[PDB]
């Protein structure tokens, strides 16, 4: 895992390039990713 | 016999976090 930098990160099949930082959102055990208004993936979960 | 379902029969539609939307 790398954090604070650019990178094409892959989540069970999710795929984007950018920066992660942490998350302020409260997800819930059956949510995996968020997305947002725009329908874009805005928050991912670690899988490991 | 029968009866009136009000408000049941909803799920939350996929594996995704939303909020204020
Ligand atoms: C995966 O294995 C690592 C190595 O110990 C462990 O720290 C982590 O909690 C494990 N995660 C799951 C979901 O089993
Ligand atoms: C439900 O449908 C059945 C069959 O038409 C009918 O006999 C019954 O009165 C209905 N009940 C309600 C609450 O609509």
Wanted: charged share 20%; proline share 4%.
């Amino acid at each position: 895992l790398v954090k604070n930098k650019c990178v094409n990160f892959n989540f069970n099949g999710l795929t984007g390039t950018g920066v992660l930082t942490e998350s302020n959102k409260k997800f819930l055990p059956f949510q995996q990713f968020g997305r947002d208004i725009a329908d874009t993936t805005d928050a991912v979960r670690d899988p490991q | 016999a029968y009866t009136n379902s009000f408000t049941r029969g909803v799920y939350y539609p996929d594996k995704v976090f939303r909020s204020s939307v």
